[PDB]
Ligand binder design. Sequence first.
Ligand SMILES: Nc1ncnc2c1ncn2[C@@H]1O[C@H](COP(=O)(O)OP(=O)(O)CP(=O)(O)O)[C@@H](O)[C@H]1O
Ligand SMILES: [Mg+2]
Ligand SMILES: [Mg+2]
Lengths: 4, 288
Amino acid sequence: EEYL
Amino acid sequence: ELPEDPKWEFPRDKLTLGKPLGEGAFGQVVMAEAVGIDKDKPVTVAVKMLKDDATEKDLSDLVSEMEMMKMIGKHKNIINLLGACTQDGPLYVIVEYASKGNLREYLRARRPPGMEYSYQMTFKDLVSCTYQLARGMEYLASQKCIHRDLAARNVLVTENNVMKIADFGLARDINNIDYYKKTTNGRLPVKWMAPEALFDRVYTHQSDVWSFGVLMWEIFTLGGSPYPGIPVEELFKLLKEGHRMDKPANCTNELYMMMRDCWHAVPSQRPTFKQLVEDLDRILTLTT
Ligand SMILES: Nc1ncnc2c1ncn2[C@@H]1O[C@H](COP(=O)(O)OP(=O)(O)CP(=O)(O)O)[C@@H](O)[C@H]1O
Ligand SMILES: [Mg+2]
Ligand SMILES: [Mg+2]
């Protein structure tokens, strides 16, 4: 979720 | 395949892998014992490696990550690269072991009773933590390299509570351009990214300063999650409009203004890491  | 590097190579026979320290969607870090890793004492360390089913790109990425560490140099506030096993076997990147884990969990586990993240850090400790990380980045920036993934999850804490910047997976050498431009799309740490990075794909020491401001927010909220109840696309909108996170509870106006300065809409108006170190040093001295 931190990397999008 | 991988070009050997004698000066950094380390014998596998002298390394005993242990319990896992962290796992990811593209890696794996485990504790280990390195015999003679100390050139003056023929040692508990951490070993970063690829998942069992990694691809060619995952390998190239970890190799690039190792290379960035080799080039950056040693600093008190940067996790130390100790060696690597790159020949006849899986790639192992050996780094200094931090007994207290990453900063996020470190802080969250040290919040006051009743403030638990789910089912103690003094003010001065928070400033000191921030100061140490600012020194680490000032050093990195002086090598004309950008980190690109500054965040509490990427800071490690040693047994002596020393802050160590880690995870150079997105780090880039900008000695020749003074600005890295990502030509394509990809999955990036959006909530820690400066507007020009998110929308213009432009990264500089000043976009790292923006991330440092977010890291500061995480520090003073004791492991809080950036932009509370704000989803993916929701954040992109807010930033476009000029949104900025609110001041943490245990924070002076001076420190909050420092955070806000790191999030200045104009990159060149943000403080440099050197300026942050100077100001943080001043604050600590007065706090002491
Ligand atoms: N040297 C070290 N000492 C102690 N713990 C470490 C460590 N290196 C990593 N860890 C632990 O593992 C976590 C992940 O480390 P790292 O940031 O290197 O992985 P990563 O994010 O690259 C994995 P992925 O890309 O697969 O998500 C850290 O947040 C920390 O909890
Ligand atoms: Mg990481
Ligand atoms: Mg990674």
